[PDB]
Amino acid sequence: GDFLIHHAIALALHTTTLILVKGALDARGSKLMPDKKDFGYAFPCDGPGRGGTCDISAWDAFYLSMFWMLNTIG
Amino acid sequence: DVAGLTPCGESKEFARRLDGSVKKLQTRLSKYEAGTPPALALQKQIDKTKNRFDRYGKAGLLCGTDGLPHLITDGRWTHSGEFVIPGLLFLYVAGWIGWVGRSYVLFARTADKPTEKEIIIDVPVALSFVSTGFIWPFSAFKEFTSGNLIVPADEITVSPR
Amino acid sequence: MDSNFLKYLSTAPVLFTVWLSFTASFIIEANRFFPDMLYFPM
Amino acid sequence: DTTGFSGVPSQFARPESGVYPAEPTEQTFLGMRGPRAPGHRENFGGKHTATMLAIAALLWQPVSEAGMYRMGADGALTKSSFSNMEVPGFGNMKKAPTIESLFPFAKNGFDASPALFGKGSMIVVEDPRDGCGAYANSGACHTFLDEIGDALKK
Amino acid sequence: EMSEAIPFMPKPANIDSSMPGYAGFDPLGFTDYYSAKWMQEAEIKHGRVCMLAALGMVFPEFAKFPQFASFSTNPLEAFYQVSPAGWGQIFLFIGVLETFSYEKSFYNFEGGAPGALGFDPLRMSSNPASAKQYAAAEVRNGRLAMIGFSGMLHHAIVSKQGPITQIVEQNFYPK
Amino acid sequence: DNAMPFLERPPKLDGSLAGDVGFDPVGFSNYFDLRWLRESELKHGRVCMLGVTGLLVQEAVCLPQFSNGKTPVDDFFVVPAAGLWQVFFAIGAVEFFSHGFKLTPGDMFSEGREAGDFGFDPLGCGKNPDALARRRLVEVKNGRLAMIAFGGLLHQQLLTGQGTFEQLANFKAIA
Amino acid sequence: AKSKAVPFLSQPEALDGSMAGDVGFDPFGISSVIDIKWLRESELKHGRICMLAATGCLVQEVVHLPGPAFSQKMALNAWAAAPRGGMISILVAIGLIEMISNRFALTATDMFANPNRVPGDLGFDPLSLGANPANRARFELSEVIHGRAAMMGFSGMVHQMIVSKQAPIEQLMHFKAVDSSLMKLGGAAGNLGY
Amino acid sequence: AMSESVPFLKKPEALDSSMAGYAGFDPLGLSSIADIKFLQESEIKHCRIAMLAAAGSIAQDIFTFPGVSKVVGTAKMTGVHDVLVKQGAMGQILLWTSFLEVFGTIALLETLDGKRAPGDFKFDPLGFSKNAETAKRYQLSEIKNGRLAMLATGGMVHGYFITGKGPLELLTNF
Numbered sequence A: 001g002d003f004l005i006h007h008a009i010a011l012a013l014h015t016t017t018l019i020l021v022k023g024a025l026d027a028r029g030s031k032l033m034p035d036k037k038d039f040g041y042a043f044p045c046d047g048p049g050r051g052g053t054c055d056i057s058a059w060d061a062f063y064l065s066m067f068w069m070l071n072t073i074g
Numbered sequence B: 001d002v003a004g005l006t007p008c009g010e011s012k013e014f015a016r017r018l019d020g021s022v023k024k025l026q027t028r029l030s031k032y033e034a035g036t037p038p039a040l041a042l043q044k045q046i047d048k049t050k051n052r053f054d055r056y057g058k059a060g061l062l063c064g065t066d067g068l069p070h071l072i073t074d075g076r077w078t079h080s081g082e083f084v085i086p087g088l089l090f091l092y093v094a095g096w097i098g099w100v101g102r103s104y105v106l107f108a109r110t111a112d113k114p115t116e117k118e119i120i121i122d123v124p125v126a127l128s129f130v131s132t133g134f135i136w137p138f139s140a141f142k143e144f145t146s147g148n149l150i151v152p153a154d155e156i157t158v159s160p161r
Numbered sequence C: 001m002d003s004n005f006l007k008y009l010s011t012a013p014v015l016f017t018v019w020l021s022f023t024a025s026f027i028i029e030a031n032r033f034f035p036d037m038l039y040f041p042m
Numbered sequence D: 001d002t003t004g005f006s007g008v009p010s011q012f013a014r015p016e017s018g019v020y021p022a023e024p025t026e027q028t029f030l031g032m033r034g035p036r037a038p039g040h041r042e043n044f045g046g047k048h049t050a051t052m053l054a055i056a057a058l059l060w061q062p063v064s065e066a067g068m069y070r071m072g073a074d075g076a077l078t079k080s081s082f083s084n085m086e087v088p089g090f091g092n093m094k095k096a097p098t099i100e101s102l103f104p105f106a107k108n109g110f111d112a113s114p115a116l117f118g119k120g121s122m123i124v125v126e127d128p129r130d131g132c133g134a135y136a137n138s139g140a141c142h143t144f145l146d147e148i149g150d151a152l153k154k
Numbered sequence E: 001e002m003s004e005a006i007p008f009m010p011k012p013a014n015i016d017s018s019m020p021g022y023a024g025f026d027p028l029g030f031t032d033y034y035s036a037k038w039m040q041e042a043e044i045k046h047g048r049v050c051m052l053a054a055l056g057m058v059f060p061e062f063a064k065f066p067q068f069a070s071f072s073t074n075p076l077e078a079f080y081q082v083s084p085a086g087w088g089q090i091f092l093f094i095g096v097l098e099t100f101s102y103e104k105s106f107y108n109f110e111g112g113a114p115g116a117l118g119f120d121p122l123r124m125s126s127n128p129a130s131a132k133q134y135a136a137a138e139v140r141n142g143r144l145a146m147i148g149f150s151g152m153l154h155h156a157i158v159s160k161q162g163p164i165t166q167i168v169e170q171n172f173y174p175k
Numbered sequence F: 001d002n003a004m005p006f007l008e009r010p011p012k013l014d015g016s017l018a019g020d021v022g023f024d025p026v027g028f029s030n031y032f033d034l035r036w037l038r039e040s041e042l043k044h045g046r047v048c049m050l051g052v053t054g055l056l057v058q059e060a061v062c063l064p065q066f067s068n069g070k071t072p073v074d075d076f077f078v079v080p081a082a083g084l085w086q087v088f089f090a091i092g093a094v095e096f097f098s099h100g101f102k103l104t105p106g107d108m109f110s111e112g113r114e115a116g117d118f119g120f121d122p123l124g125c126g127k128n129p130d131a132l133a134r135r136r137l138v139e140v141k142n143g144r145l146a147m148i149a150f151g152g153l154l155h156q157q158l159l160t161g162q163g164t165f166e167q168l169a170n171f172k173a174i175a
Numbered sequence G: 001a002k003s004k005a006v007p008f009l010s011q012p013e014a015l016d017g018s019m020a021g022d023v024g025f026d027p028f029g030i031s032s033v034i035d036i037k038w039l040r041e042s043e044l045k046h047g048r049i050c051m052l053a054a055t056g057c058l059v060q061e062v063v064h065l066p067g068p069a070f071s072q073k074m075a076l077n078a079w080a081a082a083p084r085g086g087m088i089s090i091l092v093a094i095g096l097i098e099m100i101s102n103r104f105a106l107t108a109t110d111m112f113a114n115p116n117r118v119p120g121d122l123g124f125d126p127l128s129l130g131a132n133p134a135n136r137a138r139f140e141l142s143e144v145i146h147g148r149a150a151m152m153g154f155s156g157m158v159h160q161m162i163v164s165k166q167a168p169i170e171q172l173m174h175f176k177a178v179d180s181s182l183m184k185l186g187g188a189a190g191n192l193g194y
Numbered sequence H: 001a002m003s004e005s006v007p008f009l010k011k012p013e014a015l016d017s018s019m020a021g022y023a024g025f026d027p028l029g030l031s032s033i034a035d036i037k038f039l040q041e042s043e044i045k046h047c048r049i050a051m052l053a054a055a056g057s058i059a060q061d062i063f064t065f066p067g068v069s070k071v072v073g074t075a076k077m078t079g080v081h082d083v084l085v086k087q088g089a090m091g092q093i094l095l096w097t098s099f100l101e102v103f104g105t106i107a108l109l110e111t112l113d114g115k116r117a118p119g120d121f122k123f124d125p126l127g128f129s130k131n132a133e134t135a136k137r138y139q140l141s142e143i144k145n146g147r148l149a150m151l152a153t154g155g156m157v158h159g160y161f162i163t164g165k166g167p168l169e170l171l172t173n174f
């Protein structure tokens, strides 16, 4: 039982790290917003064009990793 | 034994697991007449339950204090049939599926309409690829060393940063 | 057999449904004849 | 297009060598036909391969009978393993490896022969007919032809 | 041009007759991706270590050093019977010998021949025919020792004894 | 003449070497160097002449410092281990010095020696050329004879266990 | 332009009467989907395996190697009795034979990459028995036919060993008819399981 | 061109009268299957071994070498084989004939090269084949007698497998 939960805790540590690292490393730019750094840290989106850009900011990866942080400490 | 565990063939808690599992089925069988279909169904389940417990006891599995089999996965050879060999079996199938899928996506790139080959699969050619997967470790490593698995970093699109 | 009907059966959802039904089916059959395989027998 | 299982690597967008040697016609007795080096079939051809097998089969006869043959008081010969030859000057190793370690027939209980099958461990040739005929049998022997006769008369 | 070792395959492009143990044998083209001279240096070092290792697995069958006379003749148990001070001294000595390869590889990689650590005290390889023969013989005895040690190691795993002992007792198969 | 008249004569066996009767059915000298094969043949032959002399002598004579085996082949097993090892290393010293430290088929003949010559004629028996030719033929044929004879003497001494002359004076067939 | 084997069907393309044993039999049209070269390679291989296998069953009934591990007249019992180490030796040797005789052109995409490669022709003629080009066509025909017949014959022998727990020749010499009180076909879903 | 021995069959297209013992007898076409020089060498080998075997059967029935009756008792024909395998008699015969057969192998491979007539080991210590007409006649006599002795050997050993008598004793009794 302790083996299984530690691997769940490992899953949640790597997944929270993933969202946060992806937020840090794509903060300056990505392929959707190559100029993402001109808009700041917390901006809503770049609009519905190019397929849709909801939660594209680096702040939004903080937002998404907060759910995974709560899940892991749970 | 290993990690203070007990072989399932001499675990008393394993023995009580088998008995309780059969008493539970026998009291359901006590409510049916001999030749009925519910009696034969439960008599076949008592045979299956006993067979499983017998096989586990004689297999070299180790039981805990709870009387359930535990798997040793540290790499020791006396326990390689619990993870290392099932894992070797898995990776052979997984690399086969990967090699075969990769071979078809490269074929479809040289097609008249490359995206039509991926929603309408050329089944004779895709079956030609699935048969090739049996020697994927040799085929994929030779693919690697011949400079055809890995593309260089400067032919891959990256984000500006 | 009609080539447009065979081109229909070569579509991704049909092959996906058939292959994974065939795949599921020999796992089911393997667990009928050889049940309760927690370990590779060795 | 590509037919499927065609076998040509250029039809499946697979990298080929581009090198496809011409297939010769010369053969060797215990080897195969195919591209060889120049002069290879002249030194390692049928003449080489047949001769080497002939020497290997001749030298098998001492090896299949390998042992320490010693006479007793009369002319009677006793057979022993070559392990009984204790070499004198190799420290802690006193029993040495011999030709019986590369050909350990005895350990597997083989009883090799210079004709490869000795009096003990001989080929077993039985008769499957079990001492009766094809048709019109009586007793514990009922052939398929008898079963056809039994069905036709019933 | 086709490979000598595997006559129906084409010749591996990055190995050459210049190399002492050349047979044209690279079915998986390691030299097509890795440096052929790095691979050449690695094969020679593995062979030199294995040539000593093959003698070492065999030699305490005959005689042991008086201090380790009590130690076992199965090599896989004599490994653990040696004290960590002894293994530390071995590791330090191999480290001192490996400083010369750390200086040859990684600094003057292109100056010399693979495996040439400046160790020719008896001045062999002076005669060119002898040098040619020794180059090829070192490679072939190194490859043979690699195979032979690999055998003897796994044989000590199965039968808990050494090579000669397994042969003498005819313990050739898993009991 | 041709030793095997039905077989074609081997192409590399010209008459220049002594003892050549055109006998090479298996087909050596078509793969190996005839200089190496001839030097090997003389070495085997001269060793076996000394070997048959040793068998006959040791059946009778015994040095006082040594025990005596039942047979000259059991004479090997009562000579101290150090003595056998000293003889082995002494012969090895001779093999190194007489062959100019060139001992392999790749380098033994790269200085231009004729097969079997070590410049050994203290009594000067090979002073005459034609007499040298006759004694070359004598040497190779007596050497070949001593090879077979040594095989016979050793295997009979192993089998009976009663020497060579003792065996003849007490002949006892296989029973 | 109708098939000769099946007169009411059209003659299949990729079957032109060149190959030995070609009589126009491909009703399901596999030759139109799968290259005939691969199909003939696989047919010759299956047939060669089955010639050995049918002969294996019959001779194994009659003649045995010495020892108790080789004393199984019933050939299906020999599978279990024969030393496992040597059986896996056979398997490994077969794999080595498969890679070398095919010259590392093993797969559906690289066998026949050499235009010189011919279906079923591995270069195997140790005694040069196919040296005469006059016998070539009838050898090819009778190899294909022996292979087909032995596929059918071995299939029958295996499933007659399953039904009757008897070796093939002594099943013919001690025949017993099928009672049908055992080995009923199917039925896993008729009784809803168990 | 039709066969001299089997008139309704064709000439076997690999056999020619320059061969010794030719009668056009290859109805099964084996001379087309195997290389003919190999077949010729095999026939003469089978011929000579069977000639020795038939003569040996006859002579062993007539007399027996000194001391042999001790080791070989009621055993005769094939029966003596297992008793003399225990002894080294058959081992020694096998050793020396195998030694000769290594050189026989080299000779056959030269024959297949085409440098030697089949069965020609050049063995004529006493002089019989000096003359060419005598040489050809003896070639035919050797082939014919060897063929007869092959069938003879067959009959003799099978007569032992039936009655246990031996050739001469089967003539004397029944």
Ligand code: CLA
Pocket: F079, F080, F082, F083, F084, F086, F087, F089, F090, F093
């Ligand atoms: C350099 C000249 C030289 C010297 C000084 C020696 C000295 C010796 N030899 Mg001799 N030997 C030599 C050359 C020499 N050897 C040559 C050239 C040959 C071959 C032609 C031999 C063949 C020979 C035989 C056949 C025997 C000896 C033995 C002995 C030793 C007897 C000691 C004993 O009883 O207890 C010592 C007991 C021990 C267990 C200790 C081992 C002996 C030590 C290691 C001797 C070391 C000598 C040294 C390595 C010189 C050899 C050089 C090499 C080229 C031969 C003695 C020290 C006898 C012997 O060793 O019996 C025991 C014996 O049977 N020798």
Ligand code: CLA
Pocket: B097, B098, B099, B100, B101, B102, B104, B121, B126, B127, B129, B130
């Ligand atoms: C056979 C085709 C194929 C191959 C060779 C790969 C190869 C890879 N993928 Mg996968 N991928 C595939 C299909 C394939 N992908 C498909 C169809 C999807 C959509 C679900 C994905 C989604 C996906 C994600 C989200 C990720 C990868 C990752 C990876 C990498 C690591 C292996 C892994 O995590 O597997 C994981 C595989 C999956 C999660 C899904 C695979 C689903 C099936 C089994 C494969 C498709 C079979 C296909 C229909 C083949 C038909 C062949 C036939 C026509 C002949 C590696 C580059 C990971 C990566 O980048 O790490 C470095 C990663 O994060 N892939």
Ligand code: CLA
Pocket: F036, F037, F039, F040, F041, F043, F044, F047, F084, F085, F087, F088, F089, F091, F092, F093, F095, F096, F099, F102, F103, F104
């Ligand atoms: C340290 C010893 C030593 C060394 C370095 C050599 C070196 C050589 N020998 Mg010599 N040889 C030796 C000892 C040695 N010999 C002895 C003791 C004998 C028996 C008297 C011979 C008999 C011999 C013959 C007959 C032939 C050679 C040949 C060769 C050459 C080929 C290299 C090779 O493959 O063998 C290298 C050999 C070794 C590393 C060890 C040799 C040991 C052999 C197997 C003899 C084993 C011992 C013997 C049965 C019993 C001796 C008892 C005695 C010690 C009391 C090379 C010049 C061949 C040659 O030059 O022709 C081309 C050849 O035909 N050798």
Ligand code: CLA
Pocket: D105, D108, D110, G082, G083, G084, G085, G086, G087, G089, G090, G093
């Ligand atoms: C790497 C070489 C090698 C080695 C060292 C061994 C070693 C062994 N084998 Mg193995 N074997 C090998 C290769 C090898 N095998 C290969 C390549 C095959 C597949 C063709 C086999 C198939 C095999 C079987 C089926 C058996 C063995 C057995 C044995 C063991 C007992 C041997 C014995 O008593 O022999 C002494 C006995 C003999 C020499 C009698 C030989 C009988 C004749 C020669 C068989 C006829 C051969 C037949 C015509 C095959 C033709 C096909 C082939 C050319 C491809 C021994 C451990 C036996 C075993 O597991 O015992 C426990 C066993 O039953 N072997």
Ligand SMILES: CCCCCCCCCCCCCCCC(=O)OC[C@H](COP(=O)(O)OC[C@@H](O)CO)OC(=O)CCCCCCCCCCCCCCC
Pocket: G185, G186, G187, G188, G189, G190, G191
């Ligand atoms: C080129 C090779 C040619 C091969 C020919 C095959 C010969 C043997 C075929 C069966 C012989 C007679 C059958 C009567 C036997 C029979 O019909 O039994 C009936 C059985 C179902 O049981 P029931 O519902 O009939 O139970 C009836 C009650 O009376 C008893 O409970 O049918 C099956 O489903 C069994 C076959 C498995 C079906 C799936 C097979 C595996 C699928 C693999 C992919 C497809 C392959 C082809 C599938 C058809």
Ligand SMILES: CC1=C(C#C/C(C)=C/C=C/C(C)=C/C=C/C=C(C)/C=C/C=C(\C)C#CC2=C(C)C[C@@H](O)CC2(C)C)C(C)(C)C[C@H](O)C1
Pocket: E050, E051, E052, E054, E055, E119, E120, E121, E122, E123, E124, E141, E142, E144, E145, E146, E147, E148, E149, E150, E151, E152, E155, E163, E164, E166, E167
């Ligand atoms: C460089 C240099 C020089 C030097 C030097 C030195 C120290 C050279 C050292 C050379 C050495 C130690 C060579 C050893 C090679 C060992 C081999 C090939 C063994 C293979 C084992 C096998 C095949 C096996 C096996 C086994 C198997 C698996 C199954 C077993 O049941 C049995 C069995 C035993 C048969 C000097 C000093 C002269 C100076 C010069 O100026 C420069």
Ligand SMILES: CC1=C(C#C/C(C)=C/C=C/C(C)=C/C=C/C=C(C)/C=C/C=C(\C)C#CC2=C(C)C[C@@H](O)CC2(C)C)C(C)(C)C[C@H](O)C1
Pocket: D108, D109, D110, D121, G045, G048, G049, G052, G065, G066, G067, G068, G069, G070, G086, G090, G094, G097, G098, G101
């Ligand atoms: C690759 C492939 C093909 C294929 C194929 C197939 C199916 C090939 C199968 C081949 C087989 C079955 C080979 C069997 C070999 C048996 C051996 C060597 C027995 C050795 C006995 C020994 C050593 C012993 C012993 C002894 C012991 C231990 C103790 C004693 O008490 C008993 C005894 C005395 C006997 C083909 C060619 C068809 C086509 C195509 O190209 C693809």
Ligand SMILES: CC1=C(C#C/C(C)=C/C=C/C(C)=C/C=C/C=C(C)/C=C/C=C(\C)C#CC2=C(C)C[C@@H](O)CC2(C)C)C(C)(C)C[C@H](O)C1
Pocket: G051, G052, G054, G055, G124, G125, G126, G127, G128, G129, G130, G145, G146, G147, G149, G150, G152, G153, G154, G155, G156, G157, G160, G168, G169, G171, G172
């Ligand atoms: C190629 C080549 C050469 C070669 C070679 C070799 C090894 C050639 C061997 C060829 C063989 C083994 C051919 C065997 C064919 C068997 C058949 C057709 C059986 C069919 C059975 C049937 C129909 C049945 C049945 C049955 C049923 C089901 C009911 C049963 O109750 C009974 C029953 C038995 C009646 C060599 C190596 C010499 C070299 C050369 O240079 C090249």
